Design a protein around this ligand. Structure first.
Ligand code: CA
Ligand code: CL
Length: 133
């Protein structure tokens, strides 16, 4: 059913919430496909999750650029490394079974929750103060 439930703990800027909430929906879509043992759906969902994550990162990075956020550089490198990691995980799915999918999801969750609560939260005050929403 649901692997990760959204919490007010993850809240940030309103437009950022809609995106993180979407990433969470993808994690839940992927988990469900694993529960069903449907590896084709899993690979499909994973691909879209990855792609969306990349666009989400780009949106955040555009905000960093537009509002001259002092930590744009480091945050960008953080996003950059996760993408490589995701691309790596992606390969494990070709021959993987529902089991490997569960390991991946736990990895995805592990990274996503930590990143949102620890990394993305750093930019909230800074951007709200400059009228971003
Ligand atoms: Ca590389
Ligand atoms: Cl994120």
């Amino acid at each position: 059913d649901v692997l990760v439930k959204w919490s007010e703990d993850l809240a940030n800027l309103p437009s950022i919430d809609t995106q993180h909430k979407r990433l969470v929906d993808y994690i839940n879509d992927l988990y469900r496909a694993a529960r069903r043992r449907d590896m084709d759906k899993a690979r499909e969902v994973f691909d879209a999750l990855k792609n969306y994550a990349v666009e989400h990162f780009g949106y955040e990075e555009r905000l960093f650029a537009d509002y001259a956020y002092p930590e744009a550089t480091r945050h960008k490198e953080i996003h950059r490394r996760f993408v490589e990691t995701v691309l790596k995980w992606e390969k494990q799915l070709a021959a993987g079974d529902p089991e490997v999918v569960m390991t991946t999801l736990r990895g995805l969750v592990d990274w996503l929750v930590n990143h949102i609560m620890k990394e993305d939260k750093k930019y909230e005050a800074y951007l709200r103060e400059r009228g971003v929403s």
